[PDB]
C-alpha cells in the first residue's frame, strides 16, 4: 500500500498513506539495502532486499540463510567426511574455495537420534548398513574365490 502514495486517485487514501509514511515511526523502502563482500575475493555475497512480503515468511527465509552463513562450514570441510570413507592416510587436495561455498554443519545430534529411532522401528536397517560395508569390502578387492 505504501506504493499508492501520490498515485492513487482516491484522495483520502493518499492523504492517509502520506500521513503514515511521513510519521517518524515508519518508513517504506524497496531493496536492495544491506550488502556484504567477501573478506578476500571482495565480491558481494549475502545482500539484504526489502521485499514486499509477509514478515513471517521473511522471518523463516532469514532463519534459513542465517543458519547457512553462521555455520562457517565451507565445502572444504567435506574432505573430513571423505577421509572417514577412504583408506587410512589417503590425502585429498584443493581447491580451497572458502566462504564463497557455505554449507550446513553435519547434524550429528539429530542424525544419531534418528538412527536410534530407526533401528528401533526398522531392525532390518542393520541389514542395509551391513550391506553397505559388504559392498565396500568387495570394492577393496581384499579376498577372492579361486577354483583351486
Amino acid at each position: 500500500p505504501a506504493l499508492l502514495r501520490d498515485f492513487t486517485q482516491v484522495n483520502w487514501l493518499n492523504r492517509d498513506i502520506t500521513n503514515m509514511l511521513q510519521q517518524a515511526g515508519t518508513k517504506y523502502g524497496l531493496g536492495l539495502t544491506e550488502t556484504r563482500l567477501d573478506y578476500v575475493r571482495l565480491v558481494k555475497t549475502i545482500v539484504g532486499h526489502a521485499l514486499n512480503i509477509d514478515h513471517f515468511a521473511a522471518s523463516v527465509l532469514n532463519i534459513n540463510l542465517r543458519a547457512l552463513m553462521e555455520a562457517n562450514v565451507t565445502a572444504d570441510d567435506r574432505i573430513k567426511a571423505l577421509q572417514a570413507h577412504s583408506m587410512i592416510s589417503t590425502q585429498f587436495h584443493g581447491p580451497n574455495q572458502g566462504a564463497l561455498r557455505p554449507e550446513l554443519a553435519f547434524d550429528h545430534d539429530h542424525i544419531i537420534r534418528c538412527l536410534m529411532l530407526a533401528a528401533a522401528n526398522y531392525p532390518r536397517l542393520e541389514g542395509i548398513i551391513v550391506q553397505i560395508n559388504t559392498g565396500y569390502v568387495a570394492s577393496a578387492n581384499v579376498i577372492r574365490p579361486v577354483s583351486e
Partner: protein, 292 residues
C-alpha cells in the same frame, strides 16, 4: 570520527543497550531486577584469573573490511554461530592495535583497512587501547593460549547472582536463577543482546581511566551482567519452566557452572566447543579489564 566523551561512548544515546521486555525497550538493569535466585549446597570460590597472554596474534593480510562486531557478538550470544575459531578473523583487531595505523573501526563495527568517506569511526587512540587487549580473542583457538572454560564461570556467577557480601567474600552458593517469563524469553533476550553495539562498551572499558572508568563500571554494571546472563544460559546444565498459578517462572541452573554442553536446545543459544573457547577467552580478557 566520533569523539569519546568524558564518559564513554556509552554515554551517547546512540549506543544505549536495552532488551525488549513487557512491550517496551527496558534497560538491562530493570530486567535483572526480575531475576531471583535459589542457592544450593554447592559452592563457588573464585580463583585468581591468569593474566592474559602478552602476545598479539598477527592479523593476516585481509583486503576486505572485516565485520568484527557481528563476529564477536554472534560468537558469544548468537543463536546459530558455529566454528567461530575457524575463520580466525578476530585477529584482525590487531591491525587496529598499532600506533598510527591506517585502519579505522567503524561504528558499524567493521574494521576498514583505510579511512573512508561517510563512515563514522571510534577515536583511534581509544580503539588502539581496545585492540591492544581484545585482539587476543584471536588466540582463543591456538592451544598455547586457550582460556580455562570451567573456573572463569565462577566469576561470571559472582558478577551476576552475587550479593555485595558474597562478592566481597569471593565465594557464593551456586545459585539457580529464575524470573517471570514470556514465551521464548531467553532466545529473544539473546537476540536483543546480539544487536547490542558491544564494541562501544568494550572501547570504553579499555580506554577510560580513573574516575571516568570507575563511573563507567558503575553505570554499565547491569549491561555487563546482561551479557553474562546470556552466556550463563548458554552454559547452563538445564533450563526448566515452572508453572505457578497462571504464571510461568523460567529457571536456569546453575549460574557459575559451565556444563560444557554442546548438544543444542530450543530453550537457549548453544556453544560449539569453539564457542566455549571463545567465550572463555572473552571472559578472561573482559574480567581482567573489569578488575583493575
Amino acid at each position: 570520527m566520533l569523539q569519546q566523551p568524558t564518559g564513554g561512548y556509552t554515554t551517547l544515546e546512540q549506543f544505549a543497550f536495552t532488551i525488549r521486555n513487557d512491550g517496551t525497550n527496558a534497560t538491562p538493569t530493570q530486567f535483572l531486577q526480575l531475576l531471583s535466585y535459589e542457592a544450593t549446597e554447592n559452592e563457588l570460590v573464585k580463583k585468581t584469573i591468569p593474566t592474559p597472554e602478552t602476545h598479539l596474534p598477527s592479523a593476516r593480510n585481509v583486503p576486505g573490511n572485516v565485520y568484527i562486531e557481528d563476529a564477536i557478538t554472534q560468537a558469544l550470544f548468537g543463536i546459530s554461530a558455529q566454528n567461530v575459531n575457524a575463520h580466525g578473523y578476530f585477529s584482525r583487531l590487531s591491525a587496529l592495535a598499532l600506533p598510527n595505523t591506517s585502519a579505522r573501526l567503524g561504528l558499524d563495527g567493521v574494521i576498514y583497512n583505510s579511512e573512508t568517506i561517510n563512515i563514522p569511526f571510534y577515536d583511534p587512540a581509544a580503539v588502539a587501547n581496545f585492540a591492544a587487549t581484545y585482539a587476543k580473542l584471536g588466540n582463543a583457538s591456538t592451544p598455547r593460549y586457550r582460556a580455562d572454560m570451567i573456573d572463569i564461570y565462577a566469576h561470571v556467577g559472582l558478577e551476576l547472582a552475587g550479593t555485595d557480601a558474597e562478592r566481597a567474600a569471593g565465594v557464593m552458593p551456586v545459585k539457580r536463577a529464575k524470573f517471570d517469563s514470556w514465551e521464548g524469553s531467553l532466545i529473544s533476550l539473546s537476540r536483543d543482546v546480539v544487536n547490542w553495539k558491544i564494541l562501544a562498551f568494550l572501547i570504553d572499558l579499555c580506554s577510560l581511566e580513573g574516575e571516568a572508568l570507575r563511573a563507567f563500571k558503575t553505570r554499565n554494571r547491569d549491561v555487563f551482567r546482561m551479557m553474562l546472563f546470556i552466556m550463563s544460559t548458554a552454559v547452563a546444565a538445564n533450563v526448566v519452566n515452572r508453572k505457578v498459578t497462571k504464571r510461568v517462572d523460567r529457571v536456569l541452573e546453575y549460574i557459575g557452572v559451565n556444563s560444557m554442553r554442546t548438544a543444542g536446545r530450543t530453550a537457549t543459544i548453544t556453544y560449539d566447543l569453539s564457542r566455549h573457547e571463545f567465550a572463555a577467552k572473552f571472559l578472561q580478557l573482559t574480567f581482567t579489564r573489569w578488575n583493575a
